[PDB]
Design a binder for these strands. Structure first.
Ligand SMILES: [Mg+2]
Ligand SMILES: [Mg+2]
Ligand SMILES: [Mg+2]
Ligand SMILES: [Mg+2]
Ligand SMILES: [Mg+2]
Ligand SMILES: [Mg+2]
Ligand SMILES: [Mg+2]
Ligand SMILES: [Mg+2]
Ligand SMILES: [Mg+2]
Ligand SMILES: [Mg+2]
Ligand SMILES: [Mg+2]
Ligand SMILES: [Mg+2]
Ligand SMILES: [Mg+2]
Ligand SMILES: [Mg+2]
Ligand SMILES: [Mg+2]
Ligand SMILES: [Mg+2]
Ligand SMILES: [Mg+2]
Ligand SMILES: [Mg+2]
Ligand SMILES: [Mg+2]
Ligand SMILES: [Mg+2]
Ligand SMILES: [Mg+2]
Ligand SMILES: [Mg+2]
Ligand SMILES: [Mg+2]
Ligand SMILES: [Mg+2]
Ligand SMILES: [Mg+2]
Ligand SMILES: [Mg+2]
Ligand SMILES: [Mg+2]
Ligand SMILES: [Mg+2]
Ligand SMILES: [Mg+2]
Ligand SMILES: [Mg+2]
Ligand SMILES: [Mg+2]
Ligand SMILES: [Mg+2]
Lengths: 113, 118, 207, 120, 53
RNA sequence: GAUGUCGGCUCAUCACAUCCUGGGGCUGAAGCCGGUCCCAAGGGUAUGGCUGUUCGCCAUUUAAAGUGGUACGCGAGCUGGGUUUAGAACGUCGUGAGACAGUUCGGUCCCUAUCUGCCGUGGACGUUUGAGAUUUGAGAGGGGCUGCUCCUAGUACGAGAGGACCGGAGUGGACGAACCUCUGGUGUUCCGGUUGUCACGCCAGUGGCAUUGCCGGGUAGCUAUGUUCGGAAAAGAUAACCGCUGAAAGCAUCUAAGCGGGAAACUUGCCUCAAGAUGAGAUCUCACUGGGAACUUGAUUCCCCUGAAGGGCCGUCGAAGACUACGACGUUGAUAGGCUGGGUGUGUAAGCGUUGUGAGGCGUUGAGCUAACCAGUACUAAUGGCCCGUGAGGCUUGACC
RNA sequence: CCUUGUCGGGUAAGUUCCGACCUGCACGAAUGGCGUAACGAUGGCGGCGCUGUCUCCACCCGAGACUCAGUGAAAUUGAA
RNA sequence: CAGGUGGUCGGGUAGAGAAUACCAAGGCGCUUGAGAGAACUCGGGUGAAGGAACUAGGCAAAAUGGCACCGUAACUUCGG
RNA sequence: AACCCACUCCCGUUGAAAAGGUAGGGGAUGACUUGUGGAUCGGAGUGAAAGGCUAAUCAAGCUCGGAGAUAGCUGGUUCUC
């Protein structure tokens, strides 16, 4: 229980409650050119691990006609903010069936209001 | 390589092995003493006791969960009515294993499996 | 000198700026001193050092009387460290207090043993084909020697067997944190062996 | 792209549509090429009129891949599609407008041109 | 493959010198005075002085 | 009374007449580059197109894509494209069967390793009384590579173009060892979805077989395509070469005497094994203090009492393992299974109640199930037994009451 | 034969392939000469899809190999 | 002794079907077993990023596959 | 698809088998496949022709006689001085 007890002290609260199938917006830090600033990265969440400090989610954005996905570490001092803009029912845990579909086929349904 | 892995194969396929331990348990809850083989008794004690722990709570959902893994009317009837009530206040450790000699034909070491209060 | 610990699993800590430091956590029992080998009865100069909690019914009377020349009441293992020059008494106490930040150290230990390994895993050989006419030989070694002269296999040929649990030392790993309350060292990098093993932490001399 | 004979398209206006890797420049035998490395391409399928003819040895830098780029964190950016940007004899680009996103991992002193020309 | 010379009486008997037997884990039952194997049920059915079968 | 022939794959080892890196002499060597010759074998020494090809010719690299020996290394290690038995065909030669050191299509590659050898791993005995544990290191292996920038400095050099030596800092490639926190993979023992059919008396619910029926996910372990670390610095003795003093030979002269500088090679330095190192080493600690007779006198042999320190069998097991061996533990008890709480995974179980003519939806509703993980707990299994090992450790000499 | 003859096409690069040239060592007209739609388990090149063929292998499931009890061969051999 | 041997009978649910998947009547468990879960060999399952770079040669594996309708080239012996 | 045949890979080679097996292949209303009964024979038959088949034997079977064929060719040839 000695690494299960160090890992309580790195965790200081940064994140709200959410699920796969949401549309989050993420404020990340940008360290370039000797000036720190923020940057907004908004997409749809497709994955979650829950190992403690080793928790990490994944969010897919369609930027300028090109897909991109970004895996964020949860308790990093880079992932600053996390807001939830929409939520819906998907009845699965990992949405990896959206690396193929593109447009109207990749619509998250709405049972959940 | 087997590092920290658990469960032994016994040189049977995975569907034989499921349908054999289901059949050694269903005969143990009729006669309450079985003369069996020693490596087959060390792995019977990881199948039988989750049926005795389950029998301590009567439910329609538990009598369906019990029927769906030891599939017999007589074994479900022998639980929930005799067992799970005789063992109502013993936490764990429901049956014992006593090594007994060797088989005549081969040398397969034997064992008894016996319920603990009988 | 050095301190004897235990591998207790890998973790990961974050700095202020944002990078991740992979960290191996090492638990240290405070180490008692058993002997102090001087140079006039023994030649060399060294120190026996002992970690604790062995049951009383497992020590022989040869070892129980050996652990009572100094009031130690000792446990598992006796290790010995060769040292340049420092005085030590018979019954002393060696803690994690001689380490600081930075301070690149050496870490020894037994590795994890794989049973009886072939030549594609032990020595990283290459394989023959899989479809183009090939016979039973798909992962076997190739040839061994030359034909008529020398007529025998040279000593030191690379063949199969026992990727060992032999001793190995990782070299020049740096210390991230010293904890004199829960008795921890935090080392950035990999430490040899399985979790729950036994390990030695020595200040490095390669530098 | 990341291996010899890896079809990958270009992210450029004046270029072709598809090219193919033939040699990973660098060391003795670099087997793979990540984001921000110089490869050497042949032009495999041109646009009916651009600038670059079909079947010409050129030089390109790699800007997007499906394997991803990894930072000093457990945080990786991973696209879907491979993408290159052609160069001249000197390492300046040929075209004018770059299509799609790039990463900020690429920006060094010699590559301050194409980072400014792209919508990230 | 085959041999090229036959093996003598010496080099045949040296091979089978690592091949002996043992089963000495015997025990006397305290109650019945019956001999059996250590950590086994006695051939009458007693284990540590208790009838089980 | 048989030594299986060319090229490829796999695995290699030596030579030096050096391709690269290291040290230097001369130059028709300004600088950057070179040319040529002495010293040096430590580590390196390309992917492809075409051909049966080695070879070669090309395209693109690179610090460089060295030359030879080992049955032109290697078929009881692989292949069988070439040569190549029987079939068929073209061109040529012979009236004819047929042939060609000319072409073209098709054509079975055998072996369970006894000995030397090698890579792993145990048994027996020895080390002069016997045990438990820790070690010195005689000797032997492992490793050894290199680019590009940037500062020195656009300085020395040169009409200009072009541009350094010595030193320092940075981060790449190829190779190696370890290791799963991360990023992934696998995960037929975990949880879902679903197709055909048989069954449990029927409806519901569920279970067999269909490659794990076909798939979606995935804990532990294992793993690389991931993560970290490595190659040195320095010291000695030298090679080529550069000398300093200095005669023989009044001068000169690196040598005859004397005195230095000198490279990845050599010897240490760093990691591992290592007293079977028969030369069998060294420290600490523990154990055992009974007779008798025969016959011969390191006195030997027998009889009887005694069996210690300890070890082994046996049992529960292990990130140890082909068997062994090693390591932890046996009621002085957390060694393994179960049980009780977590954690992780999966994605709102059945039953009821509702809405609807019905499939279905909704309270039921983060539900239920959850292998290998963590923490606790004597509930079951590790039996206060047997066998080995004895009884004070020879003799000579010197010191030493 | 000399020979990878010379010229064009296809590939970043083509001793094979396709189209021509005529200098046919040694083509040629029922041992038939040149064309030819459809058919070939036929010979040779090229392309799309596709992939553990391959960079370079990692993991899992069965049957052997290994250990224990029963039975129990073979080729070979001057002597060690 | 995994081979060879002429002719009749031949139910049910799906399906064009004597193919194929489960079952009825009826019959069998293939005359050495028990372990443990090394290399390597055989018969299989999945795979990051590439997609013939392998090789004498896409050999072998992977992929394609049903019924209904739309749609269809050069060429030709006028059928294809 | 039964059925007849034998194009590819791997396994097997002391095989389960003196020519198979597991996966894939070609023909499948005819120059078809096959059951029973007969006819053709050793310099002789048959042959959509390979020198193929004629009882696991074929550029001329198998068996018994001539016949203890012939061998300038190999191998062997036995107690003492
Ligand atoms: Mg869509
Ligand atoms: Mg099945
Ligand atoms: Mg192990
Ligand atoms: Mg094979
Ligand atoms: Mg010799
Ligand atoms: Mg011979
Ligand atoms: Mg030389
Ligand atoms: Mg050869
Ligand atoms: Mg062979
Ligand atoms: Mg050989
Ligand atoms: Mg050296
Ligand atoms: Mg139903
Ligand atoms: Mg059935
Ligand atoms: Mg000793
Ligand atoms: Mg004792
Ligand atoms: Mg005529
Ligand atoms: Mg004709
Ligand atoms: Mg035909
Ligand atoms: Mg046997
Ligand atoms: Mg039917
Ligand atoms: Mg793949
Ligand atoms: Mg893929
Ligand atoms: Mg090749
Ligand atoms: Mg090729
Ligand atoms: Mg094929
Ligand atoms: Mg038939
Ligand atoms: Mg067929
Ligand atoms: Mg047909
Ligand atoms: Mg012929
Ligand atoms: Mg015949
Ligand atoms: Mg005659
Ligand atoms: Mg004769």
């Amino acid at each position: 229980k000695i690494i299960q007890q160090i890992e309580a002290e790195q965790m200081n609260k940064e994140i709200p409650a959410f699920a796969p199938g949401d549309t989050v917006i993420v404020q990340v830090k940008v360290k370039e050119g000797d000036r720190q600033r923020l940057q907004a990265f908004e997409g749809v969440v497709i994955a979650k691990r829950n190992r403690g400090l080793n928790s990490a989610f994944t969010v897919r954005k369609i930027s300028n006609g090109v897909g991109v996905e970004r895996t964020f570490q949860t308790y990093s001092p880079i992932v600053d903010s996390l807001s939830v803009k929409r939520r819906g029912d998907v009845r699965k845990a990992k949405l990896y069936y959206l690396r193929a579909l593109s447009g109207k086929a990749a619509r998250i349904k709405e049972k959940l209001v | 390589m087997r590092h920290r892995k658990s469960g032994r194969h016994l040189s049977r396929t995975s569907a034989h092995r499921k349908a054999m331990f289901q059949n050694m348990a269903v005969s143990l809850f009729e006669h309450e003493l079985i003369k069996t083989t020693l490596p087959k008794a060390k792995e019977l004690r990881r199948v039988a006791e989750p049926l005795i722990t389950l029998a301590k709570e009567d439910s329609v959902a538990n009598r369906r969960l019990a029927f769906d893994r030891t599939r017999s009317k007589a074994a479900v009837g022998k639980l929930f009515n005799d067992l799970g009530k005789r063992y109502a206040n013993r936490p764990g450790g429901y049956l014992r294993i006593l090594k007994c000699g060797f088989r005549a034909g081969d040398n397969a070491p034997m064992a008894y499996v016996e319920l603990v209060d009988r | 000198i050095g301190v004897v610990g235990r591998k207790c699993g890998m973790t990961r800590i974050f700095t202020e700026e944002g990078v991740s430091i992979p960290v191996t956590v090492i638990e240290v029992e405070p180490n008692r001193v058993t002997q102090f080998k001087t140079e006039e009865t023994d030649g060399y100069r060294a120190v026996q050092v002992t970690a604790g909690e062995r049951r009383a019914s497992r020590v022989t009377k040869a070892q129980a009387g050996h652990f009572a020349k100094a009031n130690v009441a000792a446990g598992r293992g006796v290790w010995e460290f060769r040292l340049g020059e420092e005085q030590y008494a018979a019954g002393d106490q060696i803690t994690v207090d001689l380490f600081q930040a930075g301070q690149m150290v050496d870490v020894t230990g037994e590795s994890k043993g794989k049973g009886f390994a072939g030549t594609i895993k032990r020595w990283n050989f290459r394989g023959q084909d899989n479809t183009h006419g090939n016979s039973v030989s798909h992962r076997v070694p190739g040839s061994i020697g030359q034909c008529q002269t020398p007529g025998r296999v040279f000593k030191g040929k690379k063949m199969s067997g026992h990727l060992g649990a032999e001793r190995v030392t990782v070299q020049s790993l740096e210390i991230v944190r010293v904890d004199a309350e829960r008795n921890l060292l935090l080392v950035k990098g990999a430490v040899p062996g399985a979790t729950g093993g036994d390990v030695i932490v020595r200040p490095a001399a390669k530098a | 792209m990341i291996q010899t004979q890896s079809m990958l398209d270009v992210a450029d206006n004046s270029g072709a549509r598809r090219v193919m890797c033939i040699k990973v420049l660098g060391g003795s035998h670099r087997r793979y090429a990540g984001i921000g490395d110089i490869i050497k391409v042949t032009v495999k399928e041109a646009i009916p009129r651009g600038k670059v003819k079909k079947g010409q040895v050129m030089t390109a830098v790699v800007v997007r891949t499906k394997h991803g780029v990894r930072r000093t964190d457990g945080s990786i950016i991973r696209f879907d599609g491979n993408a290159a940007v052609l160069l001249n004899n000197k390492q300046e680009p040929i075209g004018t407008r770059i299509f799609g996103p790039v990463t900020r991992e690429l920006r060094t002193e010699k590559f301050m041109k194409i980072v400014s020309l792209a919508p990230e | 493959a085959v041999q090229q010379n036959k093996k003598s009486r010496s080099a045949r008997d040296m091979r089978r010198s690592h091949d002996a037997l043992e089963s000495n884990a015997l025990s006397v039952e305290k109650s019945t005075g019956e001999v059996h194997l250590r950590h086994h049920v006695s051939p009458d059915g007693f284990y540590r002085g208790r009838k089980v079968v």
